[PDB]
């Protein structure tokens, strides 16, 4: 039948959500599944109505076929994008078709000349 996993897009690797700095800026941590695959984490953000970001931890046993943990965050406050980020090693985050258009505007361009 119909499927909502096609409404999400993964963000570029190297940069992910720090969670605690964004929730202190207005974001909300809503759901936290113990699923073991990236698409099992995305289907949870499809059923959690206020979820816009789905963060995961990699390298449990299979490396990238599987994940160690899943964290869902709203990342919005007064309709603004208050989502905070940092450089990383073992993580990635999926965005919705509504917020992925903003996630690209902060990774396609760089502040430093070197």
Distance between the termini: 49 Å
Neighbour order of strands in the largest sheet: 1-9-4-5-3
- Number of structurally distinct domains: 1
Structural class: alpha+beta
The biggest sheet amounts to: 5 strands, antiparallel
Order of helices and strands: EEHEHEEEEEEH
> How many DSSP H or I helices?
3
Q: How many β-strand runs? A: 9
Shape: globular
| Beta-strand residue percentage | 25-35%
Helix content: 10-25%
Question: What is the CA-atom radius of gyration, in angstroms?
Answer: 14 Å
PDB class: hydrolase inhibitor
Keywords: manec, hydrolase inhibitor
Assembly: monomeric
Entry title: The solution structure of the MANEC-type domain from Hepatocyte Growth Factor Inhibitor 1 reveals an unexpected PAN/apple domain-type fold
Give the key terms:
114 residues, alpha+beta, 5-stranded antiparallel sheet, two-stranded antiparallel sheet, 3 helices, 16% helix, 31% strand, hydrolase inhibitor, manec, monomeric, Kunitz-type protease inhibitor 1
What does this structure look like?
The chain is α+β, with helices and mostly antiparallel strands. The protein has one domain (1-114). It has three helices and nine strands. It has helices at 20-23, 38-47, 100-103, and strands at 8-10, 15-17, 29-31, 53-58, 67-73, 76-77, 80-81, 85-87, 91-96. A five-stranded antiparallel β-sheet has the order 1-9-4-5-3, covered by helices on one side. Strand 6 and strand 7 (80-81) form a beta hairpin. The relative contact order is 0.27. It is classed as hydrolase inhibitor. The entry lists the keywords manec, hydrolase inhibitor.
